[PDB]
PDB file of C-alpha atoms and ligand atoms in Angstrom:
ATOM      1  CA  UNK Z   1       0.000   0.000   0.000  1.00  0.00           C
ATOM      2  CA  UNK Z   2       1.235   3.580  -0.755  1.00  0.00           C
ATOM      3  CA  UNK Z   3       4.306   2.776  -2.888  1.00  0.00           C
ATOM      4  CA  UNK Z   4       4.090   6.461  -3.837  1.00  0.00           C
ATOM      5  CA  UNK Z   5       4.294   9.043  -1.021  1.00  0.00           C
ATOM      6  CA  UNK Z   6       2.996   7.521   2.251  1.00  0.00           C
ATOM      7  CA  UNK Z   7       1.131  10.805   2.964  1.00  0.00           C
ATOM      8  CA  UNK Z   8      -2.446  11.978   2.113  1.00  0.00           C
ATOM      9  CA  UNK Z   9      -1.140  15.018   0.152  1.00  0.00           C
ATOM     10  CA  UNK Z  10       2.618  14.529  -0.436  1.00  0.00           C
ATOM     11  CA  UNK Z  11       4.476  12.798  -3.322  1.00  0.00           C
ATOM     12  CA  UNK Z  12       1.339  11.604  -5.260  1.00  0.00           C
ATOM     13  CA  UNK Z  13       0.779   8.531  -2.973  1.00  0.00           C
TER      14      UNK Z  13
HETATM   15  C1  DKA R   1       0.444  -2.355  -0.519  1.00  0.00           C
HETATM   16  O1  DKA R   1      -0.673  -2.438  -1.100  1.00  0.00           O
HETATM   17  C2  DKA R   1       1.262  -3.629  -0.434  1.00  0.00           C
HETATM   18  C3  DKA R   1       2.488  -3.567   0.517  1.00  0.00           C
HETATM   19  C4  DKA R   1       3.185  -4.942   0.705  1.00  0.00           C
HETATM   20  C5  DKA R   1       3.919  -5.428  -0.574  1.00  0.00           C
HETATM   21  C6  DKA R   1       4.686  -6.753  -0.310  1.00  0.00           C
HETATM   22  C7  DKA R   1       5.431  -7.242  -1.542  1.00  0.00           C
HETATM   23  C8  DKA R   1       6.297  -8.498  -1.343  1.00  0.00           C
HETATM   24  C9  DKA R   1       5.450  -9.773  -1.082  1.00  0.00           C
HETATM   25  C10 DKA R   1       6.348 -11.026  -0.940  1.00  0.00           C
END
């Protein structure tokens, strides 16, 4: 889960 980002609005999740 969340290979992008790991944040609701940060690094396109
Ligand atoms: C997020 O949806 C998945 C995070 C876990 C990925 C594990 C990959 C390796 C399995 C052997």
